[PDB]
């Protein structure tokens, strides 16, 4: 029986600088059998690769700042940011690889309380504009090509059947 | 150098079709690690494919690909690869080769992706009664279908842009 990996919650708002924290939680326990608990954290900006953040549970990935800290055990882990910045908004994903088949949790989406306005932009620093500015390009190229791909889907069948008649 | 991981061999297939897919990888000692596949659905969920040990000897694999998916490694080219028979709707996604620090951790460098379509079967028995003229006819009203909703997905973006801009103009 394959384990499946929970994430609370699906989307979380915040503010720049606020605490966030994130669960997940295994259905079983998640003990290889060397005895380590292969429970990793990755972090995925939209329309880009996923990129790792915490593995072991709690260890620090190369290059990733202080202010992640991944904790649990048995079956409930967390991953918190003290401090929100603005490089550390996108999707976060568990991940467990203690049990053949190794199994992704289901995403949990930290994004900004945006609201119906604009005005929450006003105290970003423009270096942090910038960054939200350059992350759109990532996601409106990924939705073209989701077009490009749909109409392969919706020709190739034609152009099948043309020389095929 | 740094560490780059390129797939490539993505594409459209027909179900039941086959595909074999790369990754080429350069900046690090390719032999020294096992490879792995990762693939997102368009659902945006991620799902483990394969993992193939530093030498070739061990290979792993979930029981929704094992029997159709072989991964294998030529340690000389710096080349991964993913062997995919038999597709299914449920394999479009797009799929990632990725490195692993064995014992460690399992994905820690990741390539651009490559996307898998698989197609519907059901478009290929729907048009085999239809005439040629009209399958031409639809074949040309849908150049001006795509490129008008590939235009309105930049004007969404142009739209998300502009209070971003006048933030950074405001300061």
């Known amino acids: 029986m394959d384990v499946l990996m929970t994430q609370t919650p699906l989307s979380l708002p915040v503010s720049l600088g606020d605490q966030a924290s994130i669960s997940c939680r295994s259905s079983?326990?998640?003990?290889?059998?060397?005895?380590?608990?292969?429970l990793e954290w990755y972090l995925q900006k939209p329309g880009q690769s996923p990129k790792l953040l915490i593995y072991?549970?709690?260890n620090r990935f190369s290059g990733v700042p202080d202010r992640f800290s991944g904790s649990g055990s048995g079956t409930d882990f967390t991953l918190k940011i003290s401090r929100v910045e603005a490089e550390d908004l996108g999707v976060y994903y568990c991940?467990?690889?203690?049990?053949?088949?190794?199994?992704f949790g289901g995403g949990t989406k930290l994004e900004i309380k945006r609201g119906s306005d604009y005005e929450f932009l006003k105290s970003w620093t423009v270096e942090d504009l910038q960054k939200r500015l350059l992350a759109l390009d990532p996601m409106m190229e990924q939705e073209i090509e989701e077009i490009r791909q749909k109409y392969q889907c919706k020709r190739q069948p034609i152009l099948d059947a043309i020389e095929a008649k | 150098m740094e560490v780059q991981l390129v797939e490539s061999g993505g594409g459209l297939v027909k179900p039941g079709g086959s595909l074999k897919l790369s990754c080429a990888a350069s900046?690090?000692?390719?032999?020294?690690?096992?490879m792995s596949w990762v693939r997102q659905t368009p659902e945006k969920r991620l799902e483990w494919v394969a993992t193939?040990?530093?030498?070739?000897?061990?290979?792993y694999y979930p029981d929704s690909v094992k029997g159709r998916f072989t991964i294998s490694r030529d340690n000389a080219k710096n080349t991964l690869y993913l062997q995919m028979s038999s597709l299914r709707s449920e394999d479009t996604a797009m799929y990632y080769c990725?490195?692993?620090?064995?014992?460690?951790?399992?994905?820690?460098?990741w390539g651009q992706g490559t996307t898998v379509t698989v197609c519907s079967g059901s478009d290929y028995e729907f048009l085999k009664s239809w005439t040629v003229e009209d399958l031409q006819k639809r074949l040309l009203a849908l150049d001006p279908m795509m490129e008008q909703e590939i235009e309105e997905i930049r004007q969404k973006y142009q739209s998300k842009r502009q209070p971003i801009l006048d933030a950074i103009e405001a300061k």
């Open positions: 990725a490195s692993a620090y064995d014992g460690s951790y399992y994905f820690d460098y």
């Open positions: 991940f467990q690889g203690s049990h053949v088949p190794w199994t």
């Open positions: 072991k549970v709690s």
């Open positions: 193939i040990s530093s030498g070739g000897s061990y290979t």
């Open positions: 900046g690090f000692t390719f032999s020294s690690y096992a």
């Open positions: 079983q326990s998640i003990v290889h059998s060397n005895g380590n608990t292969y």
